[PDB]
Design a protein around this ligand. Structure first.
Ligand code: 6GG
Ligand code: 6GG
Lengths: 101, 99
């Protein structure tokens, strides 16, 4: 299973095991995820998959994602965001999941 | 899909190309349906291929290790930097056939 690491977020935090809520789980499965429980790295991996495959990044500024009017925009609750602002991105993903025990 | 740059003239990114069979197969493995693409479109599918297979280095995410992968056979290097767009265009241009 794919996973991505960032240098901006503590390791132990990236390794948290989590259970996506239904909308998020549906998004992940739409890009090939098979399971119900993931580390946060694996969640970041499949969301990268999704952004890429729907070409949500802006053609001119490819670090800006326009998620407005898209399921991702629903989940995150913003029209757009920068892929450089990782803590921000973790904050947005968190309300869409439950931590496992 | 489609993607573009700014180290390469935008006109040139729109150039219409016909990948050779191995490169075409690589593109088919990530969902490309056509025989001919814009260079932008080819780049887009190559970026997807690299993302999906995690060819990029874990730490240095702008470095791609293609050694021992079909991508390496095509490109003829074991690694390269995604920031060197001309070098990447050149590698792709060597893997086309004529429409
Ligand atoms: O040329 C330059 O100057 C810059 C080029 C460059 O450095 N490119 C490197 C791209 C590396 C991509 C590695 C894989 O990344 C991911 O899996 C990933 N997952 C994400 C999920 C979200 Cl919600 C947002 C972004 C990404 C993302 C990604 C992306 C990305 C950009 C556009 C796109 F369509 C897909 C992914 N770029 C870097 N990353 C790494 C990353 C990891 C964790 C976090 Cl919290 C944020 C970012
Ligand atoms: O997290 C951070 O702090 C910084 C991260 C960041 O800035 N991310 C930028 C967003 C990534 C953009 C994704 C869309 O890009 C592509 O479609 C693309 N296609 C390629 C084909 C090859 Cl052979 C190599 C790289 C890419 C690539 C890509 C990538 C990339 C990096 C790692 C990866 F696994 C996949 C794509 N990063 C930027 N790009 C843009 C780009 C466009 C044209 C050319 Cl000639 C070179 C690069």
């Amino acid at each position: 299973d794919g996973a991505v690491t960032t240098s901006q977020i503590p390791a132990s935090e990236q390794e948290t095991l989590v259970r996506p809520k239904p909308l998020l789980l549906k998004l992940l499965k739409s890009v090939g995820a098979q399971k119900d429980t993931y580390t946060m790295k694996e969640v970041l991996f499949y969301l990268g998959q999704y952004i890429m495959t729907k070409r949500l990044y802006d053609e001119k500024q490819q670090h800006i994602v326009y998620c407005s009017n898209d399921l991702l925009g629903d989940l995150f609750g913003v029209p757009s965001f920068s892929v450089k602002e990782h803590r921000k991105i973790y904050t947005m993903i968190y309300r869409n999941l439950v931590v496992v025990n």
